[PDB]
Enzyme design. Structure first.
Site, PDB file in Angstrom:
ATOM      1  N   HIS A 163       0.843  -1.239   0.000  1.00 20.89           N
ATOM      2  CA  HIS A 163       0.000   0.000   0.000  1.00 20.89           C
ATOM      3  C   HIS A 163       0.847   1.245   0.000  1.00 20.89           C
ATOM      4  O   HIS A 163       0.487   2.318  -0.532  1.00 20.89           O
ATOM      5  CB  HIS A 163      -1.207   0.730   0.488  1.00 20.89           C
ATOM      6  CG  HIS A 163      -1.026   0.617   1.945  1.00 20.89           C
ATOM      7  ND1 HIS A 163      -0.555   1.578   2.800  1.00 20.89           N
ATOM      8  CD2 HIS A 163      -1.304  -0.470   2.716  1.00 20.89           C
ATOM      9  CE1 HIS A 163      -0.577   1.125   4.044  1.00 20.89           C
ATOM     10  NE2 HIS A 163      -0.962  -0.131   3.999  1.00 20.89           N
ATOM     11  N   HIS A 200       4.469  11.441   5.849  1.00 23.75           N
ATOM     12  CA  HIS A 200       3.784  11.392   7.133  1.00 23.75           C
ATOM     13  C   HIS A 200       4.767  10.735   8.113  1.00 23.75           C
ATOM     14  O   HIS A 200       5.267   9.640   7.806  1.00 23.75           O
ATOM     15  CB  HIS A 200       2.506  10.475   7.001  1.00 23.75           C
ATOM     16  CG  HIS A 200       1.420  11.161   6.202  1.00 23.75           C
ATOM     17  ND1 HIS A 200       0.294  10.559   5.703  1.00 23.75           N
ATOM     18  CD2 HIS A 200       1.222  12.459   5.905  1.00 23.75           C
ATOM     19  CE1 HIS A 200      -0.513  11.393   5.062  1.00 23.75           C
ATOM     20  NE2 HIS A 200       0.020  12.574   5.222  1.00 23.75           N
ATOM     21  N   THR A 255      -5.396   8.137   7.629  1.00 30.26           N
ATOM     22  CA  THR A 255      -5.972   8.251   6.289  1.00 30.26           C
ATOM     23  C   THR A 255      -6.061   6.939   5.542  1.00 30.26           C
ATOM     24  O   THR A 255      -6.422   6.864   4.372  1.00 30.26           O
ATOM     25  CB  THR A 255      -5.189   9.233   5.395  1.00 30.26           C
ATOM     26  OG1 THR A 255      -3.897   8.840   5.013  1.00 30.26           O
ATOM     27  CG2 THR A 255      -5.323  10.654   5.977  1.00 30.26           C
ATOM     28  N   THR A 256      -5.671   5.821   6.122  1.00 25.14           N
ATOM     29  CA  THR A 256      -5.886   4.487   5.561  1.00 25.14           C
ATOM     30  C   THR A 256      -6.625   3.690   6.672  1.00 25.14           C
ATOM     31  O   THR A 256      -6.617   4.015   7.822  1.00 25.14           O
ATOM     32  CB  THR A 256      -4.594   3.704   5.324  1.00 25.14           C
ATOM     33  OG1 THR A 256      -3.805   3.752   6.537  1.00 25.14           O
ATOM     34  CG2 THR A 256      -3.740   4.410   4.245  1.00 25.14           C
ATOM     35  N   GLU A 307      -2.307  14.245   0.190  1.00 24.38           N
ATOM     36  CA  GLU A 307      -3.610  13.920   0.728  1.00 24.38           C
ATOM     37  C   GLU A 307      -4.261  15.242   1.154  1.00 24.38           C
ATOM     38  O   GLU A 307      -5.357  15.541   0.710  1.00 24.38           O
ATOM     39  CB  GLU A 307      -3.467  12.950   1.955  1.00 24.38           C
ATOM     40  CG  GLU A 307      -2.820  11.643   1.411  1.00 24.38           C
ATOM     41  CD  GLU A 307      -3.283  10.459   2.299  1.00 24.38           C
ATOM     42  OE1 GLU A 307      -2.877  10.528   3.467  1.00 24.38           O
ATOM     43  OE2 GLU A 307      -4.030   9.663   1.752  1.00 24.38           O
ATOM     44  N   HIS A 333       6.209   7.249   6.045  1.00 29.72           N
ATOM     45  CA  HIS A 333       5.865   6.723   4.742  1.00 29.72           C
ATOM     46  C   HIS A 333       5.375   7.912   3.853  1.00 29.72           C
ATOM     47  O   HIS A 333       5.176   9.007   4.395  1.00 29.72           O
ATOM     48  CB  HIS A 333       4.692   5.701   4.822  1.00 29.72           C
ATOM     49  CG  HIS A 333       3.437   6.285   5.373  1.00 29.72           C
ATOM     50  ND1 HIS A 333       3.093   6.220   6.705  1.00 29.72           N
ATOM     51  CD2 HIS A 333       2.469   7.065   4.876  1.00 29.72           C
ATOM     52  CE1 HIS A 333       1.971   6.894   6.937  1.00 29.72           C
ATOM     53  NE2 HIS A 333       1.482   7.412   5.774  1.00 29.72           N
ATOM     54  N   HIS A 344       2.788   9.251   0.328  1.00 26.02           N
ATOM     55  CA  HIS A 344       1.595   9.077  -0.490  1.00 26.02           C
ATOM     56  C   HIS A 344       1.950   9.883  -1.803  1.00 26.02           C
ATOM     57  O   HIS A 344       2.596  10.937  -1.649  1.00 26.02           O
ATOM     58  CB  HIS A 344       0.307   9.667  -0.043  1.00 26.02           C
ATOM     59  CG  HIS A 344      -0.092   9.083   1.306  1.00 26.02           C
ATOM     60  ND1 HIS A 344      -1.006   8.070   1.422  1.00 26.02           N
ATOM     61  CD2 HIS A 344       0.459   9.385   2.501  1.00 26.02           C
ATOM     62  CE1 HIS A 344      -1.135   7.779   2.727  1.00 26.02           C
ATOM     63  NE2 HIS A 344      -0.240   8.525   3.332  1.00 26.02           N
TER      64      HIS A 344
HETATM   65 ZN   LIG Z   1      -0.036   8.521   5.482  1.00 25.73          ZN
END
Ligand SMILES: [Zn+2]
Length: 257
Positions: free
Chosen positions: A61, A116, A195-196, A103, A91, A93
Site C-alpha cells: 500500500h 507522514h 488516512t488508511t 492527501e 511513509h 503518499h
Molecule cells: Zn499517510
C-alpha cells in the site's frame, strides 16, 4: 481487501470501516482564509538526533521506514501537543503525475506527494493502546513539490529496487530523518484521523507550511514500486492517496501570522 482501485478504493472503504464517514476524518483541504492564527500555540520541538531506523518495507500500500520506539530516541513535543510522542515510522503518499499525490491540499492546491511521520503518545505505553485514545497519535505532514533533488531523500530512493513488491523488506539502518525537514517549522494543526483503514480518529495533525523539493527523477522511482506481490500481475503503486473529506465541526489553527 481495501486499496486504491476502482473496486476497492476510498469510496468503498465505508462498507468495511464505517468510521470512514465519521466526524473527524482526514485528509482535509486547508482553506488559508478560514484558518486562524493561535498565539497560544508553541513552536514545535523535533528531537530526532538519536533516531534509530531499522527496516524499510513494502506493505502493499506504501513503503514504511520503521524506527526503534522502545525508548525516547526520536520524539516530537511542543506545538499543540501535551506530552511526548515517539516516532514509529514514516511513509509517503504520491501520484501517477506531478499535479497530484498529496492527501491534504492548501486552497485546493495539490502537491506531488506527502510525507507522514507518525508518532504515538508515550503516556499510553504502546502504539496499540495509543490508537484507542482521542490524543493518541501525532502525525507530521510535509508536502513535496518537484524541483531540485533532496539529498537526504536519496538513500531511500536507492533501496526501493529491493522492496519492489508487497511483503518485501530490507535492513535500513542509520538513516537520519532530519534530512527530510524543510527550513521552517511553521504549521497548521487540526484534529483528525489516519488516512488508511482502519481510519481511527486518534490524530493530532501538524502539517508544515513549507514544502520540500524533490527531483523528478526521485519521484519517478517511487512510481516503479508495485502494489502486488512477487509473481502476480503487475499493478504500479501510484495514486495511493485519499481524497479530501468534510471539515465538519472543526477549526484549523495556524502557528504563524
Ligand atoms: Zn499517510
Amino acid at each position: 481487501h481495501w486499496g486504491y482501485g476502482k473496486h476497492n478504493g476510498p469510496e468503498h472503504w465505508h462498507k468495511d470501516f464505517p468510521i470512514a464517514k465519521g466526524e473527524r476524518q482526514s485528509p482535509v483541504d486547508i482553506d488559508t482564509h478560514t484558518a486562524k492564527y493561535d498565539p497560544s500555540l508553541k513552536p514545535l520541538s523535533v528531537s530526532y538526533d538519536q533516531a534509530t531506523s531499522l527496516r524499510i518495507l513494502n506493505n502493499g500500500h506504501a513503503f514504511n521506514v520503521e524506527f526503534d520506539d522502545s525508548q525516547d530516541k526520536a520524539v516530537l513535543k511542543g506545538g499543540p501537543l501535551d506530552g511526548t510522542y515517539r516516532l514509529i515510522q514514516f511513509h509517503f503518499h504520491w501520484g501517477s503525475l506531478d499535479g497530484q499525490g498529496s492527501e491534504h491540499t492548501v486552497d485546493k492546491k495539490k502537491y506531488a506527494a506527502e510525507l507522514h511521520l507518525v508518532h504515538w503518545n508515550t503516556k499510553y505505553g504502546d502504539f496499540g493502546k495509543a490508537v484507542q485514545q482521542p490524543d493518541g497519535l501525532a502525525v507530521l505532514g510535509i508536502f513535496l513539490k518537484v524541483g531540485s533533488a533532496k539529498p537526504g531523500l536519496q538513500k531511500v530512493v536507492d533501496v526501493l529496487d529491493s522492496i519492489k513488491t508487497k511483503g518485501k523488506s530490507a535492513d535500513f539502518t542509520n538513516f537520519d530523518p532530519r534530512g527530510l525537514l524543510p527550513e521552517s517549522l511553521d504549521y497548521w494543526t487540526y484534529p483528525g484521523s489516519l488516512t488508511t483503514p482502519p481510519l481511527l480518529e486518534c490524530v493530532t495533525w501538524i502539517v508544515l507550511k513549507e514544502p520540500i523539493s524533490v527531483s523528478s527523477e526521485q519521484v519517478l522511482k517511487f512510481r516503479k514500486l508495485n502494489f502486488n506481490g512477487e509473481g502476480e500481475p503487475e499493478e504500479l503503486m501510484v495514486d495511493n492517496w485519499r481524497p479530501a473529506q468534510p471539515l465538519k465541526n472543526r477549526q484549523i489553527k495556524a502557528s504563524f501570522k
